Amino acid sequence: MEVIELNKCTSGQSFEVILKPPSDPSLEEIQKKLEAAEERRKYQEAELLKHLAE
Amino acid sequence: MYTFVVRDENSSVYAEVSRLLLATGQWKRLRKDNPRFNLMLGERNRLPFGRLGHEPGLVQLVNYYRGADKLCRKASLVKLIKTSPELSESCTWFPESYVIYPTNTDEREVFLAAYNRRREGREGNVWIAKGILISSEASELLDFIDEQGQVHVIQKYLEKPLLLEPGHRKFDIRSWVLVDHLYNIYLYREGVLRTSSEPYNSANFQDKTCHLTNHCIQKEYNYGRYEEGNEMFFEEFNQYLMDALNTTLENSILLQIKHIIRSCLMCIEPAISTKHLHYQSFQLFGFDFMVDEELKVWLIEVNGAPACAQKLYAELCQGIVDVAISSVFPLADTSIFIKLHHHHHH
Amino acid sequence: MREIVHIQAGQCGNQIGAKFWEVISDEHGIDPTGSYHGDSDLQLERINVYYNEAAGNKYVPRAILVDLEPGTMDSVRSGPFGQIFRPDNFVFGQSGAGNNWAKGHYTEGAELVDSVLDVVRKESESCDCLQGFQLTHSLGGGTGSGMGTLLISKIREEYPDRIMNTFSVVPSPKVSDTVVEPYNATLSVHQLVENTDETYCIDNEALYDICFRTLKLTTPTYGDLNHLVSATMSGVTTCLRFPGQLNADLRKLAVNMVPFPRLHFFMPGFAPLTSRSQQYRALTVPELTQQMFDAKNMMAACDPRHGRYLTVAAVFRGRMSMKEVDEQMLNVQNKNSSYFVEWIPNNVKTAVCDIPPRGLKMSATFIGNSTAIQELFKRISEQFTAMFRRKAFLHWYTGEGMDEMEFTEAESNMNDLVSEYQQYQDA
Amino acid sequence: MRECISIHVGQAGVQIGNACWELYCLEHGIQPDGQMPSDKTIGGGDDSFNTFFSETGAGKHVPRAVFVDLEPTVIDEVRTGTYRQLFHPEQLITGKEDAANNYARGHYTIGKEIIDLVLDRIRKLADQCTGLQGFLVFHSFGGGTGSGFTSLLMERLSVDYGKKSKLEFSIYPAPQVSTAVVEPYNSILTTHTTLEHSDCAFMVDNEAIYDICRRNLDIERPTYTNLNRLISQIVSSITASLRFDGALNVDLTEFQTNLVPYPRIHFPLATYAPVISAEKAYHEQLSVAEITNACFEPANQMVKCDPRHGKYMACCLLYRGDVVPKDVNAAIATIKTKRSIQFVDWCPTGFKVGINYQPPTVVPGGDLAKVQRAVCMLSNTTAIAEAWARLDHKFDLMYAKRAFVHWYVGEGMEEGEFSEAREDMAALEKDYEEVGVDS
Numbered sequence A: 001m002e003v004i005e006l007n008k009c010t011s012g013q014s015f016e017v018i019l020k021p022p023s024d025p026s027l028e029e030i031q032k033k034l035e036a037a038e039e040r041r042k043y044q045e046a047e048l049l050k051h052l053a054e
Numbered sequence B: 001m002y003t004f005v006v007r008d009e010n011s012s013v014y015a016e017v018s019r020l021l022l023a024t025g026q027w028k029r030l031r032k033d034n035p036r037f038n039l040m041l042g043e044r045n046r047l048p049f050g051r052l053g054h055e056p057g058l059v060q061l062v063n064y065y066r067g068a069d070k071l072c073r074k075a076s077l078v079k080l081i082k083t084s085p086e087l088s089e090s091c092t093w094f095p096e097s098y099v100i101y102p103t104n105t106d107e108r109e110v111f112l113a114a115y116n117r118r119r120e121g122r123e124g125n126v127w128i129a130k131g132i133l134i135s136s137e138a139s140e141l142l143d144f145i146d147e148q149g150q151v152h153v154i155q156k157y158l159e160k161p162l163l164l165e166p167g168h169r170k171f172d173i174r175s176w177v178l179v180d181h182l183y184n185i186y187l188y189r190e191g192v193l194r195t196s197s198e199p200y201n202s203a204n205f206q207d208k209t210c211h212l213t214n215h216c217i218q219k220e221y222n223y224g225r226y227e228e229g230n231e232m233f234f235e236e237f238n239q240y241l242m243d244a245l246n247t248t249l250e251n252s253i254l255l256q257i258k259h260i261i262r263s264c265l266m267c268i269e270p271a272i273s274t275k276h277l278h279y280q281s282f283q284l285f286g287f288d289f290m291v292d293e294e295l296k297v298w299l300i301e302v303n304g305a306p307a308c309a310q311k312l313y314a315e316l317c318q319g320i321v322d323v324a325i326s327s328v329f330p331l332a333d334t335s336i337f338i339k340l341h342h343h344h345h346h
Numbered sequence C: 001m002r003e004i005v006h007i008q009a010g011q012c013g014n015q016i017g018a019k020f021w022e023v024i025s026d027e028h029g030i031d032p033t034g035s036y037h038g039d040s041d042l043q044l045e046r047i048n049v050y051y052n053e054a055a056g057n058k059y060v061p062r063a064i065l066v067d068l069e070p071g072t073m074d075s076v077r078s079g080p081f082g083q084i085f086r087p088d089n090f091v092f093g094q095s096g097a098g099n100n101w102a103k104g105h106y107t108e109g110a111e112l113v114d115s116v117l118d119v120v121r122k123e124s125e126s127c128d129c130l131q132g133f134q135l136t137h138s139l140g141g142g143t144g145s146g147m148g149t150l151l152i153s154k155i156r157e158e159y160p161d162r163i164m165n166t167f168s169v170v171p172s173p174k175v176s177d178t179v180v181e182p183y184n185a186t187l188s189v190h191q192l193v194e195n196t197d198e199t200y201c202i203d204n205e206a207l208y209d210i211c212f213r214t215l216k217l218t219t220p221t222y223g224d225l226n227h228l229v230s231a232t233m234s235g236v237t238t239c240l241r242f243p244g245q246l247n248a249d250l251r252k253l254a255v256n257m258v259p260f261p262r263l264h265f266f267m268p269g270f271a272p273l274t275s276r277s278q279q280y281r282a283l284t285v286p287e288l289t290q291q292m293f294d295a296k297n298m299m300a301a302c303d304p305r306h307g308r309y310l311t312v313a314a315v316f317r318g319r320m321s322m323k324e325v326d327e328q329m330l331n332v333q334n335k336n337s338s339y340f341v342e343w344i345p346n347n348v349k350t351a352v353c354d355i356p357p358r359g360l361k362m363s364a365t366f367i368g369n370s371t372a373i374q375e376l377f378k379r380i381s382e383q384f385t386a387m388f389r390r391k392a393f394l395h396w397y398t399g400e401g402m403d404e405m406e407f408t409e410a411e412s413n414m415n416d417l418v419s420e421y422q423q424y425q426d427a
Numbered sequence D: 001m002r003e004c005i006s007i008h009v010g011q012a013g014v015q016i017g018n019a020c021w022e023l024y025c026l027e028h029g030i031q032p033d034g035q036m037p038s039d040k041t042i043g044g045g046d047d048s049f050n051t052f053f054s055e056t057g058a059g060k061h062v063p064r065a066v067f068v069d070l071e072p073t074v075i076d077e078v079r080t081g082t083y084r085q086l087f088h089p090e091q092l093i094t095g096k097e098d099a100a101n102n103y104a105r106g107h108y109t110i111g112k113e114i115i116d117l118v119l120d121r122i123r124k125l126a127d128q129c130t131g132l133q134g135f136l137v138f139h140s141f142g143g144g145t146g147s148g149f150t151s152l153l154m155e156r157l158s159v160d161y162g163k164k165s166k167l168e169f170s171i172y173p174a175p176q177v178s179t180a181v182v183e184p185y186n187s188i189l190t191t192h193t194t195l196e197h198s199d200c201a202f203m204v205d206n207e208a209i210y211d212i213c214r215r216n217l218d219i220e221r222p223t224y225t226n227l228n229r230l231i232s233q234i235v236s237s238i239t240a241s242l243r244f245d246g247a248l249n250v251d252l253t254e255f256q257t258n259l260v261p262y263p264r265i266h267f268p269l270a271t272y273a274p275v276i277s278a279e280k281a282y283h284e285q286l287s288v289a290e291i292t293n294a295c296f297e298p299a300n301q302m303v304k305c306d307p308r309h310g311k312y313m314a315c316c317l318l319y320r321g322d323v324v325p326k327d328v329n330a331a332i333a334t335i336k337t338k339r340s341i342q343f344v345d346w347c348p349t350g351f352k353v354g355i356n357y358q359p360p361t362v363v364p365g366g367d368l369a370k371v372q373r374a375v376c377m378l379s380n381t382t383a384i385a386e387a388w389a390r391l392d393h394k395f396d397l398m399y400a401k402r403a404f405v406h407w408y409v410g411e412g413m414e415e416g417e418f419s420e421a422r423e424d425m426a427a428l429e430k431d432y433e434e435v436g437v438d439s
């Protein structure tokens, strides 16, 4: 039914057609969660090497 | 070998379709969560339609139409009929109905506006709720709904039903309709009348064994007297229509049934068709009608998961396999249905 | 430029390892000299995975040859491709291991193991980005079995974040005579469950059945068995050696193939099966597909129908229709779906390379992680118990310093592995 | 004018980006060497195409793009291919070894060793931006890098550039072309961790694309090249408003305002028409009605799902070619009567329309026929949640037995991140259900 906001130019045009109306972490906490994971890796590798040394 | 799974154990009908398929030796049943099926016989709630049609190398089919619940719940049905122009408020063959909510959208106001032109006509002012009750008084029903919890429907009661003699009895008609993946609408030639076994009591509504014709509520309250199980089939009732009223089933009743069936299902076709979709649906419906003394047929409700009557399982379940399933998935190497089609030109 | 280091140990290891280098060198157009004489650029695009470059535009296998006796290494040297190997990468002792795991693992092999690791380390240092190691060996002798596992353990100590992959030859009394083989094998399996990421079970039982029943070779030799082993090794390493999407490195293969760290023992399969003899007809895609999944095509003597596939990789080689491959692959899963665990969705992956293998227009290689491999482990386990319950032949091992406890731990771990596969076969 | 930086991450992001920048070049008549005759302001400008390309004194137009992959093979192909001079080597960043289809290895393990270099390379571009609006990020959900590194990048971009907008182009996993069985795990993990950092994301299901190429381009077995040229057409269609004179969707903020009223529910469905084989000898050109109607066919959607059984919250149509508003409104009127199009009670049933008269440019010798008019519909419908349910069920199946989990724990991630990612998706599935269904 109702056309609105008709905007023309050389490239094209644009408009809106309405048929009916209605009815964050810090650079710190990041660098930390990355480093707890690297710790957990390092520990797991350490447990292996210790096992291999036995 | 075609593959299938079963996810409703309580389905009288899909139990029988299971066995019919296994017995072909061309279908293997898989465990119910194995996703590499051709056919899903699905659960009743929350059937995961979103997971169908995403297994490459498998054409997949399911025994329900998504969005068919709009026809198959009472609240939904009334909403559908009023709002859809193909049907409309003008619609002749559905009893005047209204959707009513507990006060814990609504159309209570609009219910009373029609009630109080039957207290300004003194004419038949009997209604019915949705565990269910029939009154003439409004505030005995509204106070019943609020003392219940769910959404309900208030419907004109047919004070003047067709009564079977011998017995001055009340009945309803169940017809079974299979809509295949192509949206061919197939009516099973065998229907069934689910009868009352006690004289219809004009002036006393509480004695409910005579007003409600459900197969159980007769079982659990004369059951069996005039015919087996309060079940009269089509040969008998055609005969009775001939002898007693000089008409036929086909002419006095069936044209209307076929018309109401097509109208309902063509209405929702655009919303539920699976024609361009990546899985395919079929579904068996149970349509239930009421016949007034004039021989006018009324739509009562639609059931999305009907059970069949005993005599007829054998035949109907085979018909499903024939037209719903092996038309998608052929084997190597009479029709029990009437196809409902009509292209009038105007 | 993601490099693999290859080690081959003991008689069996060196024999199948030499045959691998013959086969792939040819596929990549490298000759005994080490000179490229190929006619395609696809042969050279990931050549550095297996070969180092040298002055002269020469390609030198990144291969370490190891044995406790000189015998087979002279065999490799005087062989066809013998000249291609880096001479200082031949590490060998004098005394042998006498089919005794304990000698391989603890006494004779300790003496030689450090020199092997110097050569390994030097090869790892000249690596732009090392992906890990592949080792070839039998499990039923002493050097491949006992020293090969010692190596694996020492290599993991120095490169714990690299992938370790074996081609491990499993023994059978249909082929071999020596009564302590189940001992050496059980002890080796114990190591492999703890210290490899991927292990290809190459069962001599199955290689025998294929050669004898199916290929009608009534006088089968190791050459025949090895002809099947090399085909399969060519096929499982195709995705590593040529440009491709799927399983293109060891770590990707492992992530795709190993849902639980201990269940990393694969059933390889190959089609078409042949003896070293002319193939007159190329197979069709449906034939490859059916055959590669056939029990009779497996290089481990297990019935796939007795288990369930956890994961699968499939590799097709040759000029063929990708559509028809896709269709047939799907047809297999959809037609035998109960065989594939349903709690790993889309557990079958499929690669196609255009360069076919030598002497075949069409081939297909199968790699299965199936619960049915338990049958292989139960068979070794039964042999082991029969002797061990009377401590028979143990003095060969106690005399090199081992305690019985160590045998009880190996049997136990291997029995545990079998019940873990059983656990996932019923889940 | 306000600049836009594109970031292409992992093989999928990089190869799709390739195809986009190729297409953009052709669209704006920029040559492989980066010269644009039609640009008369040598050495600068604030024209509409400059949102994506910057200029040099030498007359060179260079994408405001950074490509990152944790292995080099793929980006090497950009480095030596037909567009080598287009980019400055500092925009092409590679590692030695990839994330092996492991979210956790791309996020935690290899991410850490390369995040700072990527940010520094991104800042070099932001420092040439007079008024940067934000970022367009391209990646797969299923790859180790595409999932894991993208999600880390997005966390960091919220920190270094809080006020700025971030849009994604995300490739949703499909077994017909997927390379890893753990794609579902990765896709949930990165969606969990990227959700708060993304203003608007356009998902493309490889399954949907693969079938469009089979069915409509008669390509028996589509390659990434086939898929990526088609994806770049859609992408071009969506970003044309940013590179061209017009009044619809002229800045990144406007995408969010026009398409995303509820922030978590930020996944608009793309449907595109028409897709026509260049090999098709004889072709009857389709009308405005025909292509507009086709935007409501699931088979043309970038994600197969069924908008009939869900509700809309916003709907744009982006036309290219011989289209005038009269024809659009007539097509919409007809369609509104033939179809199930249900908005949410709190939203106008309505469409926003963008027309650009220049028809779709097509890549020469490609699969797609040049056509007189095309359209891309962006509808935010609740039906797109069907794809979340599919992915979530696969995840539940494997996670229930902890299959493959050890690979992720091994890289330092904790088992609980899995169940936490999945609780977020279960909540997302619920938001979509609240909004989209009644009874």
Ligand SMILES: CC[C@]1(O)C[C@@H]2CN(CCc3c([nH]c4ccccc34)[C@@](C(=O)OC)(c3cc4c(cc3OC)N(C)[C@H]3[C@@](O)(C(=O)OC)[C@H](OC(C)=O)[C@]5(CC)C=CCN6CC[C@]43[C@@H]65)C2)C1
Residues within 6 Å of the ligand: C173, C174, C175, C176, C177, C212, C218, C219, C220, C221, C222, C225
């Ligand atoms: C592939 C390697 C192989 O060549 C495989 C077999 C064994 N050896 C050496 C070759 C060989 C074989 N037979 C030999 C007899 C004397 C000297 C050498 C051999 C070999 C063969 O070519 O047969 C024609 C062979 C051997 C056997 C062999 C088969 C076979 O080649 C067909 N058998 C499967 C076993 C055997 O134990 C068995 O169970 O056979 C039923 C078999 O017993 C029999 C035939 O009664 C036998 C025969 C010597 C008994 C002692 C235990 N071993 C274990 C291997 C088995 C053998 C072939 C290595």
Ligand SMILES: Nc1nc2c(ncn2[C@@H]2O[C@H](COP(=O)(O)OP(=O)(O)OP(=O)(O)O)[C@@H](O)[C@H]2O)c(=O)[nH]1
Residues within 6 Å of the ligand: D009, D010, D011, D012, D013, D015, D016, D069, D070, D071, D098, D099, D100, D101, D102, D106, D139, D140, D141, D142, D143, D144, D145, D146, D147, D171, D172, D173, D174, D177, D178, D179, D183, D206, D224, D225, D227, D228, D231
């Ligand atoms: N559409 C499309 N999808 C792709 C492309 N490349 C990969 N994919 C898909 O993305 C997933 C694989 O992720 P990739 O982008 O290749 O992974 P990556 O980001 O390089 O991650 P790693 O290799 O794990 O470091 C699968 O679903 C592929 O089908 C592409 O070029 N186009």
Ligand SMILES: Nc1ncnc2c1ncn2[C@@H]1O[C@H](COP(=O)(O)OP(=O)(O)CP(=O)(O)O)[C@@H](O)[C@H]1O
Residues within 6 Å of the ligand: B095, B128, B130, B155, B156, B157, B158, B171, B172, B211, B212, B213, B214, B288, B290, B300, B301, B303
């Ligand atoms: N407006 C009306 N006029 C006359 N009878 C009515 C009526 N509404 C309901 N009934 C009676 O009540 C019976 C059962 O009602 P209804 O079909 O609404 O409930 P239901 O869903 O539990 C049984 P089914 O699932 O088999 O249809 C009908 O068969 C009919 O006899």
Ligand SMILES: Nc1nc2c(ncn2[C@@H]2O[C@H](COP(=O)(O)OP(=O)(O)O)[C@@H](O)[C@H]2O)c(=O)[nH]1
Residues within 6 Å of the ligand: C009, C010, C011, C012, C013, C015, C016, C097, C098, C099, C138, C139, C140, C141, C142, C143, C144, C145, C169, C170, C171, C172, C175, C176, C181, C204, C207, C222, C225, C226, C229
């Ligand atoms: N397939 C195969 N098996 C072999 C070969 N050589 C030996 N074997 C098997 O390996 C076992 C003997 O091990 P071997 O490698 O000779 O001992 P090692 O030299 O001490 O490692 C037995 O199972 C043999 O059947 C071979 O070339 N191919």
Ligand SMILES: [Ca+2]
Residues within 6 Å of the ligand: C108, C111
């Ligand atoms: Ca000594």
Ligand SMILES: [Ca+2]
Residues within 6 Å of the ligand: D039, D040, D041, D042, D043, D044, D045, D047, D055
């Ligand atoms: Ca300029």
Ligand SMILES: [Mg+2]
Residues within 6 Å of the ligand: C011, C141
């Ligand atoms: Mg020997």
Ligand SMILES: [Mg+2]
Residues within 6 Å of the ligand: D010, D011, D071, D098, D143, D145
């Ligand atoms: Mg990658």
